[PDB]
């Protein structure tokens, strides 16, 4: 009552016992703190089997094994922004059937020497569909995503893909190789659109972060002997309730082969990886003229 409730942990669900001799709560000590979302929980584990029994979003239906091998990102279903989180005073448009639907991007070919590709979201859907038109026309954008990476191969083919959702996937460069150039990635590398961008150094993900530790992020496996598809339902994560869809990518979808594709001669050498993504609970605010970027 004698101090401002202005620390960085106000509004949280944990009571912090602290010591404060000042007027502001942020001046106080760190104090004490008086399935798992980070383990890529499934739809069965999230208790969301009712929303995944048959995945039909908009006028689009994907046929895939549900519930058990279908991942909800960070244990959070996508949802519309609440009144408390939202700051923009104009009411956003929620098309929900013209923009919330599965879009099929491209059919990148998986080779034995393939390195991997990344897709930046919603940069992939910036210039196609009613979702693309709404993203170009509105300043503010907020949506979840249902990424359904598909890679069909025969029972005599082998290989696994790490289909992972990397939030705020900032692309770094080789810095001239010697590390003394301060180079920056181009626009076509940072926001490669629907056709994506191939990883130059998949070990560091072209960002200096190991590919091995990518599984803390919402991830899936397309181990070809077990599953031919990877469904990751991805919520909207940002420090902001809304953001621009043209100059900020909320996450990047990494699809790299951890285990190389291999098959004997005679089998079909064209093994394509098809990226399908459905925006979920899309919210567009701040309407003006359409801008490509």
């Amino acid at each position: 009552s004698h101090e401002n409730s202005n620390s960085a942990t106000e509004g949280s669900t944990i009571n912090y016992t602290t010591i404060n001799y000042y007027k502001d709560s942020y001046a106080a000590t760190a104090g004490k703190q008086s399935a798992a979302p980070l383990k890529s929980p499934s739809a069965e584990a999230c208790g969301y089997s009712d929303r995944v029994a048959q995945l039909t979003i908009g006028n689009s239906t994907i046929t895939t094994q549900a519930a058990a091998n279908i991942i909800v990102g960070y244990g959070e279903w996508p949802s519309y922004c609440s009144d408390d989180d939202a700051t923009a005073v104009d009411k956003p448009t929620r098309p929900d059937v013209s923009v919330n639907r599965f879009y099929t991007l491209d059919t990148k070919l998986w080779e034995k020497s393939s390195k991997g590709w990344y897709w930046k979201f919603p940069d992939v859907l910036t210039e196609t569909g009613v979702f693309g038109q709404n993203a170009q026309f509105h300043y503010l954008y907020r949506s979840g995503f249902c990424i359904h990476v598909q890679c069909n191969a025969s029972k005599f083919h082998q290989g696994a893909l790490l289909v992972a959702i990397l939030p705020e996937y900032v692309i770094g460069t080789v810095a001239g190789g010697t590390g003394t150039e301060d180079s920056h990635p181009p626009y076509i590398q940072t926001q490669p659109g629907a056709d994506g961008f191939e990883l130059q150094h998949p070990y560091v993900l072209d960002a200096g972060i190991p590919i091995s530790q990518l599984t803390v992020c919402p991830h899936q496996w397309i181990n070809l002997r077990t599953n031919n598809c990877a469904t990751i339902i991805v919520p909207y994560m940002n420090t902001l309730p809304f953001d621009s869809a043209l100059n900020h990518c909320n996450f990047g979808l990494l699809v790299v082969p951890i285990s190389p594709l291999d098959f004997d001669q005679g089998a079909t050498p064209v093994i394509p990886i098809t990226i399908t993504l459905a925006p979920m609970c899309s919210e567009f605010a701040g309407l003006r003229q359409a801008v490509t970027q």
């Binding site: 609440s82 009144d83 009411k91």
Partner: peptide
């Protein structure tokens, strides 16, 4: 949590 969704005389 949003609350915006015969003629007479």
């Amino acid at each position: 949590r949003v609350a915006d969704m015969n003629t007479q005389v």
